[PDB]
Symmetry: C2
């Protein structure tokens, strides 16, 4: 009794068409490119990649209450997509772990408080609050946290950091290929979160809409502050010629795009919804 | 810092080589074959397939505490394989759900007490006891339950039921293809459970070995009784010419094979371990 015309199933079949595996990606050149990086460049690299490895793992693990919530409500279509969502997240964890393994590399809170606030406090709190009370308001706060904030701002802003480094120095071709594939999966993740927040709001009314706008405003400063957390004492040089103002500015603009996506979710036609309507990448 | 020579990573790369997706399997003939079944045959079919759909979903969901336990212990290799394990389980849920959807079909406890004892009481109890106390004894009881019992006896005995029906009546070619692929994944699931029980016993001593033997003996009668639970009042005819004694006898023998696998796990060389040493299917 599956409705294949539902929007989650559209993204579900898309995730199957655009399937990839990080074990088929050669990291030989990436290992050679590791020697091209100075110590302050390697620190910046480990900083971001480990926050990706740990963040994607936090999402893959902390998303268990939402899936249990939806299966108790008998929403088989949305449960089937979250099962694809979770595996893709763990697939992203493998991708970053294979890169760290290839370069020979074997979360402080004290130097990264914004990152810890999101992934170690606010993400597990919003998710495991569903075990306490799976209300529509807690479900929209969960969706806002892991999807629009963790992925829509933190992950997407991280992608911008990787793309700048790979094109500026012509390094890490395997990682650049990984980020493209990861950003493709994440495109469907944002669309499902937009749809999910749309369904909760259209079924729960103004009470659900307020909870989404209050939660994303509350998380906003921490999500943007994630990109103001380089390594330790800075030093004289900026690693890998990054522009700190543009990195932070991009996240702020991402945050506003996610805020406006909640405002547009009130009046959104869910039945005629297609991935192209949510600007979803439909080709690898 | 991944050890690719470890036994979990061997099965991990095997799961990637032997990857399959149930959406590429044609069920057109299966829908036509549904009309070949009498009402008592359709009931038997829905009986087993829904217990598979619900059982595989119970395993995919209730396995969250074990993965959280292993990541807190820093066992990255075993966590990476459980991530493949969980997705394959949800992939099995999709396979059975696509078959039920193709045949147009849209767990009673009262008529299936043995099935409910395993999947609705003993499986969630052994798994969520890790959240209470992730001791080595609780970890081996968890492994015995979901792996050696749920998969080694219940799932494997279910496969025997499907294979008999498909070859006796020459029906359901899509389902027969699915069961072959599912039984291939499950081959690696049993090997990892054997390895995991072996590591816990060799690191925990006699206390862990006793917990594994006490738990599988306690679950044994319920696992075998699962195959003594046809539909409702039986009637005059046996559905699909099944032999009830041979179906039950096969499960009993499966149970003893799993018991002897725990006894052999005490003296098992884990470093030289290969999939062929655990009789793992290595080709599709
Ligand atoms: Fe994502
Ligand atoms: Fe299995
Ligand atoms: Mn991801
Ligand atoms: Mn399975």
């Amino acid at each position: 009794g599956i409705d294949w015309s539902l929007f989650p199933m559209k993204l579900y079949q898309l995730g199957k068409k655009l399937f990839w595996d990080p074990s088929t990606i050669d990291l030989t050149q990436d290992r050679a490119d590791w020697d091209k990086l100075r110590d302050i460049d390697k620190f910046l690299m480990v900083n971001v990649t480990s926050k990706f490895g740990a963040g994607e793992e936090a999402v893959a693990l902390d998303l268990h209450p939402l899936i249990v919530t939806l299966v108790k409500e008998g929403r088989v279509e949305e449960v089937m997509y979250l099962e694809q969502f979770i595996f893709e997240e763990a697939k992203h964890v493998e991708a970053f772990r294979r890169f760290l393994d290839a370069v020979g590399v074997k979360l402080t809170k004290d130097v990264s408080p914004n990152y810890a606030k999101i992934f170690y406090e606010e993400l597990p709190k919003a998710m495991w609050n569903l075990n306490r009370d799976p209300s529509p308001e807690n479900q929209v706060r969960a969706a806002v946290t892991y999807n629009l904030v963790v992925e829509g701002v933190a992950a997407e802003g991280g992608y911008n950091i990787f793309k700048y480094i790979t094109r500026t120095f012509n390094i890490f071709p395997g990682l650049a290929k990984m980020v493209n594939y990861i950003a493709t999966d994440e495109s469907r993740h944002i669309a499902f979160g937009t749809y999910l927040i749309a369904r909760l709001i259209k079924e729960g009314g103004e009470s659900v809409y307020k909870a989404a706008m209050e939660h994303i405003n509350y998380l906003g400063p921490y999500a943007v502050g994630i990109f103001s957390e380089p390594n330790v004492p800075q030093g004289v040089e900026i690693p890998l010629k990054l522009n700190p103002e543009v990195t932070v500015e991009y996240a702020k603009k991402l945050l506003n795009v996610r805020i406006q996506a909640i405002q547009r979710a009130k009046e959104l036609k869910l039945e005629m919804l297609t991935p192209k309507d949510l600007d979803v990448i439909e080709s690898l």
